[PDB]
Amino acid sequence: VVNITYMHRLPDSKGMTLVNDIVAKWNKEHPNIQVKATKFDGNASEMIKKLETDVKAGNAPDLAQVGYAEVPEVFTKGLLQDVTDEAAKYKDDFASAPFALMQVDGKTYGLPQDTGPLAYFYNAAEFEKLGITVPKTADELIETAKKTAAQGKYIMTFQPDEAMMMMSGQAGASGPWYKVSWVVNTQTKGSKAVADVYQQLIDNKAALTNPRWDASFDNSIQSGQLIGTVAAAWEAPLFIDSAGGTGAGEWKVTQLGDWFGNGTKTGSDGGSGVAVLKGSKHPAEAMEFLDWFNTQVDDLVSQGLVVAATTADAKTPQKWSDYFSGQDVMAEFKTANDNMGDFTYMPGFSAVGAAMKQTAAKAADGSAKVSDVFDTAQKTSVDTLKNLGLSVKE
């Protein structure tokens, strides 16, 4: 018997199809390839560091969730095992764009699992009650956000603890920060647009500045104070659970608007693959399981995933459609995915993220400017690449 270990950070929230129950199906079918999946016991940003100490000690799993934005980091630290020939067998099960983000220099290190396009969640019933529409332009966004804020209702958030992806995603919808020497410019037209829009919203107290993962964010939904936010597609079931029933049958999803010089494009906020790590003695069996696991479309959608698999179209779960006004929100998430700008990540992006969070907390409380978050991103980007002894231009 070949024994495969898979470490994931999928939510496994009550009501979801739990990873262990999906893996149980494979294990009954495949006596000779027995998989143990475990949910990483930590916050998402601690997982790569735990994989790094596991590889050093030799208690690394065969498979591990790795964000596409983490692939360059774990590649450069030598944690990944080349499984190019295994991946080629499964390539035709997966969308080309996310499959390519599991590759470095024409070698493949795993299979893509999901994408994280940004979209816009809103209470459509409350918009109708307030006599507003989803704003088409940045000027309409700011005007309408002031109009709801004047009734104690908020249509935007600025999430200091999600600076890394909310700021890079909204800004990155209109162009890259990083071009590969590395050429670094986090102060693009898109960065300036996002800084300008969020600075107006914060200055006019027309966005909520609660951290995404704090109780204050949840209380903002449940109280009916929060009636619109940019959101990564995978937040859908997490948002519903955070709502505490508030908004049930009233919410909808639409595309990120043309607010940041992005037109009909959106940005990337997470999205992950599963990598084969250094040390796996059974990469063929690991990748055969992984291809199966990542093509269990309905099971993976239940965890909030906008699946990378092309084998079967993703449907909206009944509970999500119940919450979102009967809307097929997954159809919106697929459109958003199709419209998501390419956005190369540098190795060490997570250190950039860490410094952006601290600046963003100051932007929220008014002791910094939102534009300072993108200056932080520039300095930390260049310093991180120099410290990895990489050639940088700025």
Ligand X SMILES: CC(=O)N[C@H]1[C@H](O[C@H]2[C@@H](O)[C@@H](CO)O[C@@H](O[C@H]3[C@H](O)[C@@H](O)[C@H](O)O[C@@H]3CO)[C@@H]2O)O[C@H](CO)[C@@H](O)[C@@H]1O[C@@H]1O[C@H](CO)[C@H](O)[C@H](O)[C@H]1O
Which residues make up the interface to ligand X (CB under 6 A)?
Answer: 10-11, 43-45, 67, 114, 116, 161, 164-165, 213, 234, 270-272, 304, 350, 353-354, 357
Tell me how crowded residue 272 is: count the other CB atoms within 10 A of its CB: 30
Concatenating the DSSP letter of every residue in 140-187 gives: HHHHHHHHHHTTT-BS-B--GGGHHHHHHHHHHTT--SEE--EEE---
Length of the chain: 394
Please state whether 365 falls in left (phi above 0), alpha (psi between -120 and 50) or beta.
alpha
Q: How far is the CB of 42 from ligand X (least distance, A)?
A: 9
The residue among 172 and 353 lying less far from ligand X, judged by its C-beta, is: 353
The residue among 176 and 271 lying less far from ligand X, judged by its C-beta, is: 271
Q: How far is the CB of 125 from ligand X (least distance, A)?
A: 26
Q: How far is the CB of 240 from ligand X (least distance, A)?
A: 13
Q: Tell me the residue ranges of DSSP E strands in the chain.
A: 2-8, 33-39, 63-67, 103-104, 107-108, 110-112, 114-115, 118-123, 178-179, 182-184, 228-232, 251-255, 272-276, 306-307, 392-393
Q: How far is the CB of 204 from ligand X (least distance, A)?
A: 26
The residue among 226 and 274 lying less far from ligand X, judged by its C-beta, is: 274
CA separation, residue 248 to residues 213, 237, 239, 251, 268 (Å): 21, 12, 11, 7, 27
The residue among 2 and 44 lying less far from ligand X, judged by its C-beta, is: 44
Q: How far apart are CA 235 and CA 194, in angstroms?
A: 21
How many helices and strands (H and E) does the chain possess? 17, 15
Q: How far is the CB of 302 from ligand X (least distance, A)?
A: 11
Residue identified by tokens 């470490």 is 7
The residue among 135 and 348 lying less far from ligand X, judged by its C-beta, is: 348
The residue among 134 and 354 lying less far from ligand X, judged by its C-beta, is: 354
Cα angle: 227, vertex 211, 316; to 5 degrees: 50
Strands 228-232 and 118-123: antiparallel
Q: Is 73 annotated as a binding residue?
A: no
Q: How far apart are CA 347 and CA 73, in angstroms?
A: 4
The residue among 141 and 290 lying less far from ligand X, judged by its C-beta, is: 290
The burial of 159, by beta-carbon neighbours within 10 Å (0-12 exposed, 13-18 middle, 19 or more buried), is given as buried
Q: How far is the CB of 138 from ligand X (least distance, A)?
A: 26
Q: Assign 361 to helix, strand or coil.
A: helix
Q: How far is the CB of 100 from ligand X (least distance, A)?
A: 16
Q: How far apart are CA 165 and CA 161, in angstroms?
A: 10
Residue nearest to ligand X (CB): 270
Q: How far is the CB of 354 from ligand X (least distance, A)?
A: 3
The residue among 200 and 359 lying less far from ligand X, judged by its C-beta, is: 359
The residue among 334 and 357 lying less far from ligand X, judged by its C-beta, is: 357
7 forms bridges with which residues in the sheet? 38, 64
Q: How far is the CB of 347 from ligand X (least distance, A)?
A: 13
Q: How far apart are CA 274 and CA 109, in angstroms?
A: 8
Q: How far apart are CA 85 and CA 276, in angstroms?
A: 13
Q: Assign 60 to helix, strand or coil.
A: coil
Question: Which residues are annotated as part of the binding site?
Answer: 394
Question: Which residues are annotated as part of the binding site for Zn(2+)?
Answer: 394
